[PDB]
Structures are given as structure tokens and as C-alpha cells.
Amino acid sequence: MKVILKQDVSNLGKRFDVVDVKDGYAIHFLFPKKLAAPLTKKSLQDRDLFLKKQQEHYEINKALSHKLKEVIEQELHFSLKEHNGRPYGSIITKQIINQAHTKGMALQKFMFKDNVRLGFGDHEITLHIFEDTTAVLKVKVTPD
Amino acid sequence: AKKDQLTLRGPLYGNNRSHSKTITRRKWNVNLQPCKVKTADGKTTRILVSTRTLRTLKKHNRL
RNA sequence: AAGGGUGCUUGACUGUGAGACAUACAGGUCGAACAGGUGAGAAAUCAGGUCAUAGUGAUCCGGUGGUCCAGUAUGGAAUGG
RNA sequence: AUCAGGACAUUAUCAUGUAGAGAAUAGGUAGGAGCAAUCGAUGCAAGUUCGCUAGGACUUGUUGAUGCGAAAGGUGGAAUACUACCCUUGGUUGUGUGCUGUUCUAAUUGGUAACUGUUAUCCAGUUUCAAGACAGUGUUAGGUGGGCAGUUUGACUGGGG
RNA sequence: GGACUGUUUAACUAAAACACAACUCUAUGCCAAACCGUAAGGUGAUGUAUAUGGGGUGACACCUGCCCAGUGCUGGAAGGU
RNA sequence: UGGACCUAAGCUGAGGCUGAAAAGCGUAGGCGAUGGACAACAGGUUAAUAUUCCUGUACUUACAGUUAGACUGAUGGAGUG
RNA sequence: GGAGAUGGGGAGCUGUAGCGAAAGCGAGUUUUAAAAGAGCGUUUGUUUGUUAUUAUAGACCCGAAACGGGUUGAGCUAGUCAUGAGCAGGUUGAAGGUUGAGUAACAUCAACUGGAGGACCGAACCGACUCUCGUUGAAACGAUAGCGGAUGACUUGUGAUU
RNA sequence: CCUGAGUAGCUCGGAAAACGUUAUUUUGAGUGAAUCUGCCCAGACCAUUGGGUAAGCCUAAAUACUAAUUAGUGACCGAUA
RNA sequence: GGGUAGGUGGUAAGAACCUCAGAUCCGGAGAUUUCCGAAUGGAGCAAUCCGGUAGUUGGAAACAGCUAUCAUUAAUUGAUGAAUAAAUAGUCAAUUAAAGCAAUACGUGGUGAAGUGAAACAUCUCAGUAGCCACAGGAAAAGAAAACGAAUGUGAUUCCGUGUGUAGUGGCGAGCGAAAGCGGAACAGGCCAAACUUAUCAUUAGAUAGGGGUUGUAGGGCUUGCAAUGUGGACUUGAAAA
Ligand SMILES: [Mg+2]
Ligand SMILES: [Mg+2]
Ligand SMILES: [Mg+2]
Ligand SMILES: [Mg+2]
Ligand SMILES: [Mg+2]
Ligand SMILES: [Mg+2]
Q1: Residues of B with Cβ-Cβ distance to A29 under 8 angstroms
Q2: Which domain holds residue A78?
Q3: How far, in Å, CA of A127 to CA of A134, rounded?
């Protein structure tokens, strides 16, 4: 088992620390955003170097998150079949992701927060890029 | 085949020695679970893997 | 009298057993005599359950009590005897 | 993953209890002769709990320096303040477990649909939809189980039953 | 006697047996239940309770009484093991 | 009559699914007439063959080369079958 | 080593001290307080040949019905499935429909049409109720003569399947 | 500093080993260590003493068998063998 | 090459030839080697049917001669490419292996009965036997101690005799039956992982190829010196000889 947390303080009192209890296949193991620390060098060996790498990926998380914000705010156009504005089917996170590759951006659909769009027109969708960084993406649904 | 794919550990054949020691041939099947895995080329795959190797995969961080 | 009453006790002993009976085997039955330490009795004597004949069931396995037995190298123990 | 509930321990915290006599609500064994005052009394107001309708205590606000017959009286089998250890019963922050009960999803499932490999009702992959840590599945353990299997089911016997 | 027409023990029994139309009871809410298969898979069904499987009676008419102690079946919510 | 055309029940079955093993299931494809589609009649002859050979008269399906006309129109859609 | 007798090969086997459950003791030893008593002992070998008997292997021979495992068979027959064929001949004359009467309009009735049915009589066809014959037969289940169904839950060929 | 981790063990069901499950050895399910002052072993077990270092691989020879090629043998058969 | 004087396979005489320019015959090496058959272009009722592709010849052209090639699977290499932008699945091509058979025998491994014995029978035995199945091999398997096991001890494995029908195990019934020790046949023990070091991988290497090192009277690595040039084979190519 690997006790480590990363990128935030999640659901309990802790820090960017190894303060992690044995849960096994839980929020520890199906969350590929927190360290799986091997405690054979994570006492003092992997302490400072991985700490500085944490700040490196932390600052480049701000960096690339801001860059993808610039990409987002420099509009997703998803065309759909609508009956005078009300659609036949529905615009969910996967369509929004796939259409965001028209901007060259590969984003996970799990960062796109919200419920299914059933209408023509504009929608501002919240994008959880990181624990403390959320972007606004404009999504435009047009009749085809 | 009801054996796993990482290793080839198959069923074990033994006796159902009940009370009064009547023998009856019986099979033991490995615990097979559909947990995923990630290879070092992408190609995430779903493989029927036994639980004993699932633990090894879990500690070597092969997911 | 081997029956009835009384006094005293517990031989309703331990360790044995020459010689016989009847027996396919297993088993059963009787018993002089010897050592230890006793009871009754003045003493001789008697007493190893009852007047006699039935009243009971192998082996294996496991348990219980004692032990001048062993204890998978040694000391113990477990486990056996 | 998360929230709620109640149970038993305990970290820190209070109390809790009426046979009579005993100035009174005596739970047991001690060290015990003094003890209180800004870790603030007499008199009063409110209240949780408790109930012997009388009492206890805890918690607050005002009060302000004179006090304890619940030290010494006196009782009684056990005797009074003050520092401790042990019982009955309740509330608390706290964990530790599991127990039922919710919600949510990423594991997982699909004989919901769409798409591609593809001229393919199997299949694999992506998405959707419904379920949802249940189900199915491996081991382990109870129950019903002639559906199924291997077997016994005596002998004498004026024939055998 | 059985309602009928039919089927049956090739090669000793064609019948009063079996079937049947109709009746009732029960199971089953769809990945249905039952079933074959170790499982995949498949039937049921390219069906959906006016449908499907099973038990029992056996056209048509009239009737189908009493007992829920025992066995079985269904439900139960506190307790006991 | 049948292949070289077609498919039914069904059989086989790349990949694939399931199964200690062999094998089992199954998709695309492929096979599979008892069926669909396809153009020849009469008479004569030999010991033995005959819509097969011969005589007489026919039709079909391909292939080029040629004359004239016309823009053809499928591995797929539809109708017919 | 002549697919030899044999030579090497002492590792082991039996006998030479028994008794006791055993440590142990030792011509004694176990039981026993007992050195009494009793039990058991206080020397008669071994290796081969041959014969009798015996043990484990089928073990004198022949003899089951059966038990289990793997395969081969649905070309007869039973069922299902695809696809085809067959039922001479003759009767009865349904339901429905058209018309006429009747009905306030129905209902009902009469004529005509129509041509149903697990219908009728009976050959091919299928089946197999009775007698007689034959029963080492013509025949490993039949013949003459009768017999039931014969447009249907029918009969039958070809192919596939359990 | 290194000396083979879901590993040796421990638990639930079974078995190989002479042993009918027991030290040793293997394992379908669950859990799960240590690092030369170590780890395992000497029929449950602990201490002392002593032996050996798993959890990685490879290995001729002696051994089993002869349908086959060649030479040859037989106190083996001699056409119901 | 040998070897001579006959020969053209047996039921087989005759007919017609070859041969003593050295045939037939015998031995070595070669080539041919229709069709089916693992069968493999596609089928299929085995030994038959129907083809594609690329050459060449004939032909005016269909078409016919004559050649080669055309299964699936696995590994590797290259190209291409989806839902989806990249990527992977997939598809196409090239090269290399096997798929099968049999010696009714031997070996290993998986799975695994019953008859019978117990005077019946279930625990048990028959039996890990037969059978089914996979896999080779000339032999296989096993194997160089986390050992034996009771000692001033042996020192990989295998096989034979004995230990012994013992110690034990068994409804303590039937039955089963070692491991030590001892005498023998044969005899060899080698090599990786990891410490450390090198080069390179967006070096996030935790990866790729080297050096180094192989273990128990503990060893190896790390720092420092001396002695070494050699045996040895579980083994590559040539030459010569028997
Ligand atoms: Mg008496
Ligand atoms: Mg008496
Ligand atoms: Mg000892
Ligand atoms: Mg009836
Ligand atoms: Mg009746
Ligand atoms: Mg020991």
C-alpha cells in the first residue's frame, strides 16, 4: 500500500503529505492524481527531490492550465438536429471534449462539470482543471 | 480456459472428504476478476486476472 | 446345623501358588502351602465374601488415578508405556 | 467516498444512590482533625436532570466578608470537612468497531441504444442508458435435497413366509 | 365402459389403457419461470399474463359436503436453540 | 440427369466466446437438392447404344471482325421471381 | 570369464545369553518388600541339493448374469425439421349469400344459389380384429378368405438431426 | 553496501511422502516478516548446542526400452504346434 | 567402384533382342519422383471437381498448350489506418519455424474409475493400475543441500543388493511399507539477479547494451598492495593420422 497525497487536501484534514490511511482500491487507488509513494525512499531520499518536482509540476500545472484557459477563451461549436430549438438528442461532456479537439486541446471529460444540454444557443460550462483552478468555457449549440 | 492470462495458474483437483471420510472428486477454481491493467505502449487492456496476481500488480503499481 | 439373638470388627486383604477338575481354543472352577500386616478369641483355630449352583460381554479406540520406565542431538515438555 | 442513528469500552469532564435514630437523601475501604474567602459565601432569580413533592446537585447573573452542630456537638451496625481507590445510573466532547438506513460514483454488470473494424443479429473498442459497491463470481460454512450414486436389508426353520 | 375421430405393447395383449376438446389449481413482470449444457450458447420466443411451463381431472347437463390436529405450501415478527 | 448458377433445413467455420485436456458454441465466408433458373424435335440404323450416332429441320450462350442506331448505367436500392 | 564351472568380493544373514513393555541386569532375570514362590532360561550349529505342505501373484482347469472406461451406430423404427409427390369413383348437401312474404323495423318462414365437414359407401394406399393353415415353415412373423380408416391428429419418397 | 517478496510463514479446505494428514514438501482461498547479533532445520514446542543459507537457471555418465540393420544361439515349435 | 560371362523379376517353355568396346548383378552417391493423404489455391461423397495471379507460345479473341505461385497460425520487419485530432485495434506485404506420422516399447505431466480383497460393506485395498489427453527425446525425469541425522561423522543426482518384511502406519482388520547406515556400477559441477561502475535513451529510467560478481571453515562489492601467465573443460573451426 502507498500512503501519499498530492495536488490538494481532499475530504479530510491533511496537506501535500503522506498522511494517507489504508483504503486499498479506494480514493487512494482509482484516483490517478495523487502519489503512490513507495516508502523505501520516501522518508528523506524522495522527500526533497520529489518535493521540488511537486513544485515543478505545480507551477507547470498553473502554467499549462492557464495556457489551456487561453485556448478556451480564444468558443466550442457543436452543431445538432433541433426541432425549432429543442434538440432530438443531447449534448454531454464527451461531445464537448471531442469538439474541443477542434482547438487542438485534449482535455479529460471528467473535468467538464455539468448536466446535459437539451437546447440550441449558448452555455457556459465549468471546467475543473485543478483543485484551485476552474475555467469558464463557452459552448455554442447550433442547428444543423 | 478458466485460468488467468498473466500466469497460467489453473484449477486444483482434490477430494471432498466429508464426515465419515467418503471421497468425492472435486475442483478448486481460481478467483478470477476482470480488473484492468496498463501496458507500456498505451493499449489499456481488460484481462481476466486472478486475485493473487492482482495484489502483486497492486503493489508493483502496474494498476 | 449352613437357622434365630448378642459383643467386636471389616479377611467383601496384599503379593503369590504346588496339585487337580472340566475343557477344541478363549475361558471357567477348586485349592493345600509360603511371606507381609490385621480382625475375633484365653487358646487352639477361623477368615482371601455370603449354604452351593446363575447374577453377565472379547479385541480395538479414547478417557481417569499412581509410577524405583522411555523422552527422535542436549535439558525439560507434548506424546506414549 | 460521504452523511445519519443508536449500542460497549475508554481518553478529558461532572455527577449519580433516603430501613430508623441521626438537626439531614449515610453507595463501600482508607490518610484524616481542622476547614472557606477574586479557581469569590450569607439573601435572591432562572434552568437541564432527578423526584420520597421534600431534597440533591450541576450552570449561570447579582451579592460581598463574614462563616462550618454535615471538624469539634450528638447519633448509629456503617459519621460527616479536606486529598485518594472501588460499586449502581446518566450527559458530554472523543475515538474503535461492526449493525441496520440513506445519498454519490470510478471498480464492476448488462440479452438498453448509437458508432466503427464492416457488405457481419457473434465479437473487441468508444459514447450513451440503466443498475450500482448490491448482483454475478472463487473459497469457507449451515439448511432442504432418492433429482443422482454405492451399499446393507440376519439365522434356526419337519419347504419357505 | 369410454364421450366421439384418433395412438399404442414391430414379432402372442388394440382395450374399459393413452390421447383429446373443455375445466380448475399453481408458477411466471421479461436477461421471465421451467429446461439442455460444467460454462459459453440455445429453446421458452423474433413470445409478453386474452402469454408460457407444470400437476390433476377429461365432450355436454346438474353437482362438487365436513376436517387445517399430522405432512406439505405461503406469510410472520418479538423471543428460544 | 448433375457440376461449371442458386439457395432451405442443416453442416462446416477465419478471427472470437467458453471449457482441466481433447473438444463444445458461433459470426463473416463456403458447402448443402428432395426445390428455383437454363436452349432439340421427328424418324431411321447395329447383335448389343441412342432427344447422344445418321438424315431433315431448329434454338441457345459466349467470342471477335463488320454495317447502322444509341450514352451506358453496378459488387449497391427497388419490382418481379 | 567361452552368452561357462569358478576366482575376487564379508556389506550383510543365521547361531554363539537370556529375561523384561522399557531404561537395565546378566547364567541369571521379570513380577515382588522378598534374595522365598512361580514364569522363562542355565548350548546343540550352518549352507546347499531334493521332496511334501504353505504365502503373493489368474495359481488345477472350464463356466456366469454382471461392474467400469473409450468408441461405433437414427440407412429398420420413434419424434422433429426443410422440400416434393399421392388419395379411381360415387353420395349427403352445412354456414353464408340473393330474392319473395312478414316485421312499425327485428326475429321467423319459403325458393334459388353455395359446396363445408378430424362426413358418408368403396378400389389403389395404410393398418393388423378373427378363424384355418404353416409352426426343422415359402417366410427368423406369412397366405387364401373376411376386416377398420381412406381430405386427414392422413400416407409416402429424398436430405439433415437427437 | 549487496546476498533472489505477495516470497518463508500463520489460518480454512485438500494432497505428495512408508504414514488413513503429522514434523518435512506442495496449494485453491485470506492475511503476511526479517536481513549476518539474520533466515531455516535436527517428528508438536521453547532455550542451549550443532548443521545449512531457500524464495533464479543449466548439466554427460551409470539407468529403461528395441518394431529396426548385421552376425549367431537355443536340453524353443515343427503344419490341431 | 567391385565383378565376371551371361541376361531380359516368380507361376515361364517358346517368340524378339541386349551382351564379353565389358551388360545383368552387388555397394556408395544422384535425378526423375501422376494422384489422394498433415494436404496447405477454393471445394469435396479420399484418390475427383472448380479456379485466381504473373510469365511465354499458338490464335483476330474468347480459348488451349507450357512454366512458377496462391492455406492458416506465431515471432520479427516495413507500409497503411478507424469511432477520435494524434495514438492503438484492424488491414496489406516480406522472411523464418511447426501443423502430421510411428517402434502396440520406453519418459514426463494432467485427469482418473470399477471388477476384486475385506470371506457382506461405506473408511481402506485393486491404484495413482487400465483408459482419454498434451509434450518431446534418443533416452527422458531428477539434481549440486535453507541436506542426512547423532557423531572428533557423510559431503549432488541416478541405479543394483542389504538394512527387513524392521521402526512405523492401518475400521490397529484385510493389508501397506520406508528413510538412515553399509557394500557397489558411474562421477562434473557450472552460470545469472543484486550491490559498484560505464555509454545512451524529452535520461522524470524504474529502461537498453557493456564491465563486475556467484556464495557458508560465509562470500562478493568498496579503499590498497603482492603473485600470476599457467591448467582446465559440460566446449568453435581447420589440418593430419589411426
Ligand atoms: Mg446369603
Ligand atoms: Mg448368595
Ligand atoms: Mg531430547
Ligand atoms: Mg383420466
Ligand atoms: Mg372417469
Ligand atoms: Mg528435535
Answers
A1: 58
A2: 68-143
A3: 5
